[PDB]
Design a protein around this ligand. Structure first.
Ligand code: CL
Ligand code: NA
Ligand code: ZN
Ligand code: ZN
Ligand code: ZN
Ligand code: ZN
Ligand code: ZN
Ligand code: ZN
Lengths: 231, 228, 231
């Protein structure tokens, strides 16, 4: 697609002057290639990454692309929950010397899920905002825990200076037929958590998510309505 | 057993009592919920409120009569009415209250009053000590999502007792009785993590069964395997 | 039965001058009491116990019966696998200061079974006989691991100087209609393990077992034949 950059088996799409979406694919029975999206953010003289690819090899390719297209050191990465599409490439981040951050709950779940925990645990205030001492020097990344939904540990990220907020796997596109939630979903609170994401980033007009192309805020209201059906 | 008003108290160890309160739940009838009272030197520690403020005040008045030591702090194990229904009674009495940060985030949505203090947890599940000041023998462990996303558990140092709250059901239970806020994927691992956090505990106290052996942990984990 | 002795919820039957069988019961609602048998052995001025009762309180009843009726200290207990009927009372032994022994695998399985591990681990040679250094001062107790059957960890015990051998839950009543084997039974090897128990204690004429009264060697051959029907 126009605006998409193929790089090995990954796809990169510039979303804003300092923001790109990375996309990697995992082959799954019945579906073929399943895409997962993350973000790359240029912040002055460094790069920040949100979410790995499905695998270490793919995540190394993200770092390779950053070297080629941006040529600035990757300072830190934040992963948004303990599923393979978000934390599958933690090893490649650590081998590159990148400081990694995740919800403390994500780090506690990672071993059970067969993932590597991030090096640092984020903790959150009772109002959902990250405790700033657990997320030092995050630059424009505003990390918000909306409550359980897609998973108990899912977190979300707004990018200061842009119209962009990343709902991860919590938010689905405005035309999604289902939420694709599984047994680790909290179907009682999912709707309120989706709405709390909307409220935490009320001005964001481009909503980026893991398994759909970027959408309008209609993705948030649609997701919450579909989640209403689950309660 | 001992009675103050509508509350029942059962001594479990020299310094530990179980408190039991009841609420009529549409269909089920009178549902019991258990919490703990711990005497620790010159003070008393409470785990979980009763279903209501009035019932929780009854706990506080039994403590004053039978123990006659001030209640230093209370910890609540998740944002459901049987564990946090009586928060206002604790705050009216000047008691410092603690809950998982996530429990305090959920409390408004659940129609609960939030605790005054938020507990946070290391990646290994043990509470960050700075967030649980002066908990004495209370060893607070977050086992992972199960009954709810926010459920926490507590062992009593120097006793055989560990409190699984609503995560653990007794060895004769037929089901977990979990709802939409349960995590059926991780429930079994969380039950097993609770057992591993308090591996020497021989009396397992829980919210909706009388105290049981470690068979309650194993049975709960086996039932949880069947929801995965 | 004639000659049996009651203490609380337990029944004791003298089998030989220096050997008693202890029987405890577990209430299975709608099914009645499930009996489990173990052994008590007088060896000079000390007593040796094979298997606990189902619970700590029942096992304390065993210890009190020993004190009252034999009045010799219990030096050690050996438990024959990690099921409630054999290890359910470990805490009662430890509280009384009795040294406890089990197959290393039984001790490894105990935590996940909700049991308390024994203090000491037995290990076994390739021929099934216990490594003597791991079973110090066992006196007349001859411990044999016959291979997987009832469980992977089940062990068996002969009593030197008597005609008695204890098959635990591996050997079943010669009138049994089924093995009552569960998910942790090894049905490929069960028959060979029962036969190995018979060959390890070839002169034993009284076969004591966990869930029926003492039998002849027919209990061994019948059990092996029942297991043959499952290979
Ligand atoms: Cl995953
Ligand atoms: Na025990
Ligand atoms: Zn996910
Ligand atoms: Zn996803
Ligand atoms: Zn609950
Ligand atoms: Zn409950
Ligand atoms: Zn058995
Ligand atoms: Zn048995």
């Amino acid at each position: 697609e126009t605006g998409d950059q193929r790089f090995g088996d990954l796809v990169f799409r510039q979303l804003a002057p300092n923001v790109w979406q990375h996309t990697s694919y995992l082959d799954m029975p019945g579906f073929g290639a399943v895409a997962s999206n993350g973000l790359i953010v240029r912040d002055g003289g460094r790069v920040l990454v949100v979410d790995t690819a499905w695998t270490d090899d793919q995540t190394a390719q993200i770092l390779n692309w950053i070297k080629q297209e941006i040529n600035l050191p990757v300072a830190l990465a934040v992963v948004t929950h303990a599923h393979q599409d978000k934390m599958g490439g933690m090893d490649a981040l650590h081998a590159a010397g990148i400081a990694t951050y995740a919800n403390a709950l994500s780090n506690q779940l990672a071993p059970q899920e067969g993932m590597v925990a991030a090096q640092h645990s984020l903790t959150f205030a009772a109002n959902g905002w990250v405790e700033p001492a657990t997320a030092p020097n995050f630059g424009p990344l505003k990390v918000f825990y909306p409550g359980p939904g897609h998973t108990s540990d899912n977190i979300t990220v707004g990018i200061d200076g842009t119209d962009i907020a990343f709902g991860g796997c919590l938010i689905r596109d405005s035309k999604a037929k289902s939420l694709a939630q599984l047994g680790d979903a909290d179907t009682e609170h999912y709707a309120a958590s989706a709405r709390a994401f909307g409220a935490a980033f009320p001005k964001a007009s481009m909503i980026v998510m893991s398994h759909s192309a970027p959408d309008s805020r209609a993705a948030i209201t649609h997701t919450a309505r579909m989640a209403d059906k689950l309660r």
